[PDB]
Amino acid sequence: RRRTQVMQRELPRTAVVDIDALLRAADEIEDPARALVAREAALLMAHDAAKYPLPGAPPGVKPVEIPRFSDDELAEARLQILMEMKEKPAPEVVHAIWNRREENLNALRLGLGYYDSDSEDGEDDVANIRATLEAALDRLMASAEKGNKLEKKLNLHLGGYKNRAEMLRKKLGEAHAALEKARNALAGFQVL
Amino acid sequence: MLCALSGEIPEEPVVSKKTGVLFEKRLILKYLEEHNNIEPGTTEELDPETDLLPIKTSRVVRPRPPNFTSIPSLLKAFQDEWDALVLETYTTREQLARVREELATALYQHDAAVRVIARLTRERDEAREALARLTVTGA
Amino acid sequence: MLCALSGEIPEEPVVSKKTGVLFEKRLILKYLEEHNNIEPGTTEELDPETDLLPIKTSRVVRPRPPNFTSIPSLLKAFQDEWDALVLETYTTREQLARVREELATALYQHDAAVRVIARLTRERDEAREALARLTVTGAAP
Amino acid sequence: ETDLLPIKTSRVVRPRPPNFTSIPSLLKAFQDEWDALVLETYTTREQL
Amino acid sequence: AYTAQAYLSARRAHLALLDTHGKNAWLIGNWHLEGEVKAVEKELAETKREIDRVSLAR
């Protein structure tokens, strides 16, 4: 319960979390409330990565101590946030916004997580596209190697079965031809 | 294609006139004799001579084995792959729409929480300034 | 009119008896088998035999284009359609993963903001108690 | 509609080779099967 | 590259399904082919026996 519920949920998270770099990025926020929220989110992400070790994460992650908060205080904060919340937009409006985002920004552009909204430079987008293409090529090469190994193993397992099936098919074709010839010969013999 | 009772490939297949189940001729005769002309799996009577129709196989066309290289088998595999891809795409689209709606709601809630946090920070700063002024004046 | 599962016109469309949603019979059967008889887009149970009513109308005569008059042209068109569908599925999966990562980051930021708001509320309550104690102890003129 | 009686039985499982595990391989196999069927039809017509 | 990766993932899934059910699929296919070949051989043998009987009577 002291650990963050984001790590305990089904949402994906990064295996390696850098507390210092994320805190330094949080300190650069001009808004003080946003900077405090980002710093506490960095601390929560570090605590989630340390207390809950994800697969592929580095071992020996130092846990981060945070102050204990009562459930009543969290409920009061949630009620204050809900009372200060604006009107919830309709699902049709959110769907239209998503469609506008998918129409203005390309599907290939929206599929990459490095396409920042403030990155108007084409060189950064080209570099991100090149990095994504290199990663996709490496993943495709690894998947092709794994598929080739699996196909070689399956072929070595079932080559005898395939040869037996081919021999059975050839025998069935020869038997069908012989049966047709025998039927023609039997009809001719009956007529004769 | 296999017998309903024997479970193997029947050399002399027979089909029921009421149920259409394919089975072996000897197995169907034995089941009708044992259960007093009752079809297997059905409570209705089945005549051994009338309700059982023998299956005749014609060898006019060339035999096509049921392998993966068959044109109908390839078409069925392509249709199954297309159906699986369509179902996966529909599930992914529904999940993406739900995630986008949740992200929009979370962005609105984060903006509201940032405004509330700014108001609380201003109130805390005012309270700290008032406490400092009271401590300075309260000699 | 298009099916809700595939996005195209179904060959044998069926309409739900509760929500009135038209979908392909094979697609609805596959969805009910995979999701344990769950209707698409709803949490209500949809019976594959009783809750789906088939629609008996005229067959949609799709006009054959003059380009698809040969087997190789039709095969190339089918391969291009399959490649486009695979690329669209990969793009949708990547967009879903990016949206999930953004939602996780936003949820972490919101939980951090809630914790900071609780801490600020506790600090404000302590400051208000200290100010009340100072006002009670202080002799106001 | 009256003289045709359907047969209800278990579905026949076709043997899937390990080589035709990909969509492009399946498309190539389908094209080869279509070409073989066309050649067989032409040879059957010539033989007839 | 994304299309190639999707094709490779589909090939990996098909190879996993093959490694799961290939013995059963090959056994069922071989049994069906053997049954069809046996039926064809039985039909040919019956036709040959009928032709031999007709030839002997004639």
Question: E10–D22: do the CB atoms touch at under 8 Å?
Answer: yes
Contact yes or no for C99 and B100 at CB 8 A? yes
**Which residues of chain B are within 8 Å of residue A85 when distances are taken between CB atoms?**
108-109, 112
Q: Spell out the residues 6+ positions from residue E48 whose beta carbon is closer than 8 angstroms to its own.
A: A182, A186
Binary contact (D18, A151; C-beta < 8 A): yes
Report chain D residues whose CB lies below 8 A from the CB of E22: 16, 18
CB of D16 closer than 8 Å to CB of E18: yes
In this complex, do E19 and A150 lie within 8 Å of one another by their Cβ atoms?
A: yes
How far is it, in rounded angstroms, from Cα A189 to Cα A176?
20
Nearest CA in chain D to E14: D21
* Measured torsion, CA atoms of residues A79, A81, A87, A92, in degrees rounded to the nearest 10: -100
Rounded to a whole number, what is the distance in Å from the CA of B4 to chain D's nearest CA? 8
Residues in CB range of A87: below 8 A, 6 or more apart: none
Breaks (C-N over 2.5 A) in chain E follow: none
Q: Report yes or no: B53 at the D interface, CB cutoff 8 Å.
A: yes
Cα torsion through C81, C86, C91, C94, rounded to 10: 170
CA atoms within 13 A on the CB side of C75: 16
Residues of D in contact with E26 (CB under 8 A): 15
Long-range contacts made by residues B100-107, C-beta under 8 angstroms, separation at least 24?
Answer: B100/A94, B100/A95, B100/A98, B100/C99, B101/A91, B101/A94, B102/C103, B103/C99, B103/C102, B103/C103, B103/C106, B104/A89, B104/A94, B104/A97, B105/A88, B106/C103, B106/C106, B106/C107, B106/C110, B107/C106
Among the listed residues E10, B33, E4, C107, the one whose alpha carbon sits nearest the alpha carbon of residue A37: C107
Q: Residue B59, SS3? A: coil
Q: What angle, 0 to 180 degrees and rounded to 10, lies between the N-to-C axes of helices B71-137 and A71-83?
A: 100
CB E2 within 8 A of CB A136: yes
The residues near C129 (Cβ < 8 Å, ≥ 6 apart) are none
Q: B114 exposed, middle or buried (CB, 10 Å; 0-12, 13-18, 19+)?
A: buried
Q: How far is CA A65 from CA A44, A50, B50, in A?
A: 10, 11, 85
Partners of residue E3 in chain C, C-beta under 8 Å: 83, 86-87, 90
CA–CA gap between residue E48 and residue A171 (Å, rounded): 18
CA-CA distance, B55 to C62, in Å (whole number)? Answer: 39
At A180, the amino acid letter reads E
Instruction: Provide the 3-class DSSP secondary structure of residue C50.
Output: coil
